[PDB]
């Protein structure tokens, strides 16, 4: 017929057995707070669908943060509230403070907890083996949990992970992109930042799963231990799947699309080529070899693989040998 | 190469009162991802926005609603709400601010602001509910435009928070408070609390 | 064919100026101390009261025109002293009820009519300004015309004086104030904002 | 034939035996204060040669008053400072706060203590016997003192006496008219308000003394207890000495000028006439008899007499029977 179906190995039917409400945010209603409850202060960062400042809940003077959702559809706005709410109270799953709106502009405004996120220029500039392993683990914790609740992020990236290095606390953000995983469901492949997109997205394969978060993750680790922000640095959208291929190889790629008979926009045809699958030992400059470990590599290689079904999952990544040292010190995993 | 009739923008950003307006390069207007939600405001959204990007007319058609001109309005009308949204943009600011370094906007009326250059603003984001004003980064208060020309520009087209926003982005650019203040003097010295002065509206 | 005063008080920028009826000018008891200021005190003051020239005389110092200056220059120091007078006030205040003077730029003063004034009583050290009985602060004149009138000619204390005499005429404080809002709400102490002149 | 020279029966030589400095203000130097020291408030009245406001000494926030002497001669300005200084610290003699000047205009500005005046026109109508006696006594205190220092006021009148009825505090003002009494010195008779002028002034007798202050006072009291503001109400300057005559009588008057052979401007000749000396019992309407006492009358009649030498003086007035009741409590000073 054309492209071949696929599905999710774990948490494969969470949403299924859950209520219509849990997943149908389209028909979700918001319980707004009060604008006056908190006022602005200093600007933190810009987005494309929103602007983020640092405010303060005047009702107590507690440093709060405020994202202001720029006009979009009632959709992308709701599928960020509902999601956010089902996850809040989750581990490392950024707590959703509250929702308000410009009394006049009727403009939307999100509120979360505060986080002294150390910028990365510092982070990937003074982290050591453990740190990474450690943090990489805390992240999975989140992914596993949101996956548990049957939700995928679709926008994982350094940009979206608040790190309180002083407080070894870490939280994930921007749930605007995350959606729900439903069996055999096609989603939009125009998600995630360029440098962090998955192959399924680079080849218009619209029926992916949580596995997507994993790729984007693998990317992060690469750039990290190897120290190349980002590791897959392409110009356009097509030069991304190109850089990617100049590393995992070309073969496993074609074999992928084959395994799924997918309409590969003929454009690539002359852009990819023929490439060997470089042995990671190629990205070990003198300046990073102290982050580079065999389990490290190994672990990585088990995410960075064209087929989305072949990437390790939450729980799985979490049980790899890279993490051992880390989880050991988890005297009571679950308690 | 030789002809620079520029768009409709370089045109409209060259009329009386439209001195405050900055030309909104289309990179941002073409990206329909921004024009969002507008269509449910301006009338004849399309027909208008084309006139704005300089496309092509709809020329032999009728004109009962005198649309041939009714659109002209929507054109300008609409370009406003865009210019507003724009100037917010991290880039639109650099343009605005370009005009500030040379105050195409005007200076502060107060004498103790010492000719402090201001930036436009709107008291309301609603058309007709007010016109443009002039926030002063120094005094931190607003003033009605100087010359009678800039007197028919809707404040809504400049954004209630544009100025405030501009300094969230460029706090460096926020002037210092007045060196000195106005000292009232009669025959030789200050005028202690005239609190009483006021008290005479019961017998006036 | 018509008075000098009504002529000079009819030129550009001289809209703020009120015609100083001579009842007060003739009464030399007022012109006191001026002579030791303006040059050619006499010759000038004649020109102002509309007397008679001194016409075939020389003109090396171009006196025939250097006096024109003194005439206007002088009429200033008088007009200032005058508007003080309990009566000169009525004249000024007459122009206020119809603000031949101009209104307050602030938007929350709601087109509040103002009265001229001078930052300094010294010629050239400052020009006229505009006290606002509401905001109680001063603003530089609007139009570029009223831009060469010396503040000295209106008296630093004139405005304040005027209300000492007419307390009832002192406006009410602004009904409301300007409330800064972005996307929906007020902007708490930007104290920090400023802090960036160290790295700018 | 050349008018009869008299002399200030009392304090006749105070200034004499006093230093050249004490009386020669012409050569007096001022120790100015700081303009900035205080700033304005209300405007307590206009004027022609001085404007008064109510200010406040920023250096403590104390309600002060400010007279702004309008351009005059260095004279009349100095003969109000020097006078004022020598008197200050005097009983009921308005304390001279300080002297400043417009830093640029070089304009002068006087400063005095503050006083909650309940303007006579609205207060007097509500005073009772004592009040008057009381106040009339405090006044004398002043006059006596200034006379002590050899100075006459020449402008005593309700208008010039600040009364803080609530605080029973009282001070005298307008020392612009006051001058020095020197033996045999001719002064100007164009002083004092019409209604309060003395006969020596209404008959161009230019050699009068402190006794002048007394007449003007007598007038006050009359108007007061009798309740006729003023009691000697004339039109011009000649119709004053006329009304006056329609009361003390004509006789004692002529006898006066005679006693001093004075050039009586023949104008009066047909304006005065022949008048009996009304018995004060003529000014006691039902509405004032409660202020009208015999000592009151008696005391008065002892000031209102054409001859300036016959008027009671400071200390003297002060020992009359009208005052007894008051004089007592005052002694109950510190003793209580
Ligand atoms: N120390 C003071 N405390 C309170 N009020 C004062 C004081 N000194 C002066 N005044 C006011 O100022 C008046 C005196 O002003 P002055 O310079 O004598 O004027 P004038 O016009 O010649 N007098 P007048 O008849 O009272 O209007 C008094 O009659 C008071 O109302
Ligand atoms: Zn200002
Ligand atoms: Zn104002």
PDB file of C-alpha atoms and ligand atoms in Angstrom, chain B residues 108-110 112-114 116 118 135-141 143 177-178, ligand 2:
ATOM      1  CA  UNK B 108      10.061  64.638  26.806  1.00  0.00           C
ATOM      2  CA  UNK B 109       7.952  67.797  27.493  1.00  0.00           C
ATOM      3  CA  UNK B 110       9.080  68.036  31.106  1.00  0.00           C
ATOM      4  CA  UNK B 112      13.802  68.345  33.946  1.00  0.00           C
ATOM      5  CA  UNK B 113      13.958  65.374  31.604  1.00  0.00           C
ATOM      6  CA  UNK B 114      16.317  67.505  29.574  1.00  0.00           C
ATOM      7  CA  UNK B 116      14.701  63.038  26.804  1.00  0.00           C
ATOM      8  CA  UNK B 118      10.565  59.022  23.991  1.00  0.00           C
ATOM      9  CA  UNK B 135       6.222  56.966  27.232  1.00  0.00           C
ATOM     10  CA  UNK B 136       9.366  58.574  28.597  1.00  0.00           C
ATOM     11  CA  UNK B 137      12.007  56.106  29.906  1.00  0.00           C
ATOM     12  CA  UNK B 138      13.089  58.848  32.307  1.00  0.00           C
ATOM     13  CA  UNK B 139      10.026  60.403  33.910  1.00  0.00           C
ATOM     14  CA  UNK B 140       8.333  57.039  33.378  1.00  0.00           C
ATOM     15  CA  UNK B 141       4.993  58.689  32.660  1.00  0.00           C
ATOM     16  CA  UNK B 143       2.527  62.614  27.450  1.00  0.00           C
ATOM     17  CA  UNK B 177      16.438  59.579  36.873  1.00  0.00           C
ATOM     18  CA  UNK B 178      16.353  63.409  36.530  1.00  0.00           C
TER      19      UNK B 178
HETATM   20 ZN1  LIG E   2      10.197  62.584  31.478  1.00  0.00          ZN
END
